Write a protein that binds this ligand. Structure first.
Ligand SMILES: O=[N+]([O-])c1ccc(O)c2ncccc12
Length: 124
């Protein structure tokens, strides 16, 4: 059984649009999305389909770029640091569940390095 996916809207949560959050969607996310290694991270981990019934026994704060993208489109975040923390949760979950050198980890590491390149300079 997969858990419910993380929320992409929350009426009790204050919304905001900043230049930096616009940039995270238009430039950072949408460029990472097109990377050849992006596909495992474009939706919540489907532990059933992948026959990983221990995934959500280990990973208790799941995150994926599909959730992040919908959050950005919904202005779910208050600032860019909130969105960047979601990215870092997604990368860290992959390194927690997997082992150095695994094909999936090499993919995550490729994206994380590109992610770090892209957020080195945010608009003002
Ligand atoms: O294919 N996947 O979606 C996937 C995503 C993230 C992960 O940490 C995975 N680990 C093992 C197998 C598939 C994984």
């Amino acid at each position: 059984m997969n858990p419910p996916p993380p929320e992409t809207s929350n009426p009790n949560k204050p919304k905001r649009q900043t230049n930096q959050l616009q940039y995270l969607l238009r430039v950072v996310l949408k460029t990472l999305w097109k990377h050849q290694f992006a596909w495992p991270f474009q939706q919540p981990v489907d532990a059933v389909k992948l026959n990983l019934p221990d995934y959500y026994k280990i990973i208790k704060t799941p995150m994926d770029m599909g959730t992040i993208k919908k959050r950005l489109e919904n202005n779910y975040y208050w600032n860019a640091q909130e969105c960047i923390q979601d990215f870092n949760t997604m990368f860290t979950n992959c390194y927690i569940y997997n082992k150095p050198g695994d094909d999936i980890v090499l993919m995550a590491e490729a994206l994380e390095k590109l992610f770090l390149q892209k957020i080195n300079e945010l608009p003002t």
